Design a protein around this ligand. Structure first.
Ligand code: YC5
Length: 462
């Protein structure tokens, strides 16, 4: 009488800077996506999410104490006893992943890690924790980061982002060229990112007036995370739902009636103008279903100087496919061919380059021959592969499997075997046995380094 495997799940993401205070008795509004912003319909209140991922910062509780509160809250909402998938804490930065008990045998390859940011006097409270796992055929990654504070420190925050994405060790270690921004079908990155509304401090009361009027446009046009993303300084290739809730920081505790912005000894004589510190972003592989269903803040949880933030997603997932052939052999019907491909790179290097193709649909990664370097009119390096690239032999040829897969590409120096660029191509093509255009930007350490384009031709068993 077996349950069919799901094609979609829903995922709850929560981020809350607890302000080193215990929570109040009831926090159910957080997990129900109730309060301000894009909120969840009351008719869904009893419907559990498949996975709940809870990020806290300045968390004063033990793991045991917080788990008890989280599992009690979900049991009260859903009448389901959730299973702990993972919990990881760095200082007062914590991530908890809970899942429905029906998913226990669908979840495997659980990994946890942390990154400590800063050096000397800036090393010791900021950084990130993360969790990854497989859910049937789908890889999922989660990062909770507490970045550097202070309106004046946006460039430090961006540097913290770069260190966390470089050094966090999650997902499949065989993906050696790839950082966390390429290792997962779906990556969620959330936390107290600490980006501020960059307006003069003498405009504090004007900001507060705008918030009372629910007029956020002239505030969001100064939000440092939106502006730094627009200028491609941080979070390149990530998505964020539109913000329609009031700034989540800095509140007087025990009410939400008051923003506490003025400089005090306790703030290091810094102003804390109302800001959207607390954020949820995501990055999914191309042409994978991911829809944000809610993004908002609670109104009734007042123990911290921050309000909790919620986001929920519908995320596509795939099954653990088994054929008569693969896993454990190739499906000789299937092939992936690349035509007229070239990489464009921002490097001043003149080493030869080769490609690596990595995918779960291959027995192991495939190394190309070196490309042919030409110079581009506007200075650039163009690496031509023509029709020279290997024919890739997937383990399964069934189009129901193969059109859902993705090929990661790294372009590496022949001289150093270091990756100069990483990207991803979807096999969710408009046609099979047809030459079709393909494209990915290339990044290294999460920054743009070039592009890969050409044509693909996919053979399936149909
Ligand atoms: S689970 C896991 C273990 C080790 C590394 N490097 C990972 F990325 C993940």
């Amino acid at each position: 009488m077996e349950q069919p495997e799901p094609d979609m799940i829903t995922i709850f993401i929560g981020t809350w800077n607890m302000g080193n205070a215990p929570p109040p008795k009831k926090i159910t509004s957080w997990f129900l996506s109730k309060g301000q912003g894009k909120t969840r319909d009351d008719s869904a209140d009893y419907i559990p999410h498949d996975i709940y991922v809870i990020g806290t910062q300045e968390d004063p509780l033990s793991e045991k104490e917080w788990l008890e509160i989280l599992k009690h809250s979900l049991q009260e909402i859903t009448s389901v006893t959730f299973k702990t998938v993972a919990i990881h804490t760095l200082w007062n930065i914590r991530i908890v992943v809970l899942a429905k008990p029906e998913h226990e045998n669908r979840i495997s390859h659980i990994c946890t890690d942390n990154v400590k940011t800063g050096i000397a006097n800036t090393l010791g409270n900021k950084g990130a924790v993360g969790v990854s796992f497989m859910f049937n055929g789908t890889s999922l990654g989660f990062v909770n980061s507490h970045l550097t504070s202070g309106s004046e420190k946006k460039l430090r925050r961006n540097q913290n982002y770069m260190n966390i994405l470089r050094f966090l060790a999650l997902g499949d270690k065989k993906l050696s060229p790839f950082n966390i921004t390429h290792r997962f079908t779906h990556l969620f990155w959330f936390g107290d990112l600490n980006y501020r509304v960059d307006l003069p401090t003498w405009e504090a009361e004007t900001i507060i007036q705008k918030i009372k009027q629910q007029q956020y446009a002239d505030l969001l046009s100064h939000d440092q995370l939106l502006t730094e993303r627009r200028e491609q300084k941080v979070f390149l290739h990530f998505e964020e739902e539109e913000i329609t809730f009031a700034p989540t920081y800095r509140f007087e505790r025990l009410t939400r009636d008051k923003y506490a912005y003025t400089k005090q000894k306790a703030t290091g004589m810094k102003y804390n103008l109302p800001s959207w510190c607390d954020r949820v972003l995501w990055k999914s592989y191309p042409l994978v279903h991911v829809v944000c269903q809610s993004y908002g803040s609670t109104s009734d949880i007042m123990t911290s100087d921050h309000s909790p933030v919620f986001a929920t997603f519908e995320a596509g997932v795939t099954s653990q496919f088994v054929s008569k052939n693969g896993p454990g052999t190739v499906d000789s019907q299937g092939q992936i061919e690349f035509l007229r491909c070239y990489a464009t790179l921002k490097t001043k290097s003149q080493t030869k380059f080769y490609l690596e193709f990595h995918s779960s649909c291959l027995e192991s990664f495939v190394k190309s021959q070196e490309g042919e370097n030409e110079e581009g009119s506007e200075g650039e390096l163009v690496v031509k592969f023509g029709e020279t690239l290997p024919k890739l032999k997937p383990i399964i040829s069934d189009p129901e499997y193969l059109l859902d897969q993705h090929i990661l590409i790294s372009i590496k120096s022949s001289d150093s075997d270091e990756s100069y660029g990483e990207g991803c191509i979807a096999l969710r093509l408009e046609a099979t046995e047809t030459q079709l255009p393909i494209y990915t930007p290339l990044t290294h350490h999460g920054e743009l380094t070039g592009h890969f384009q050409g044509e693909i031709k996919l053979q399936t068993s149909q």
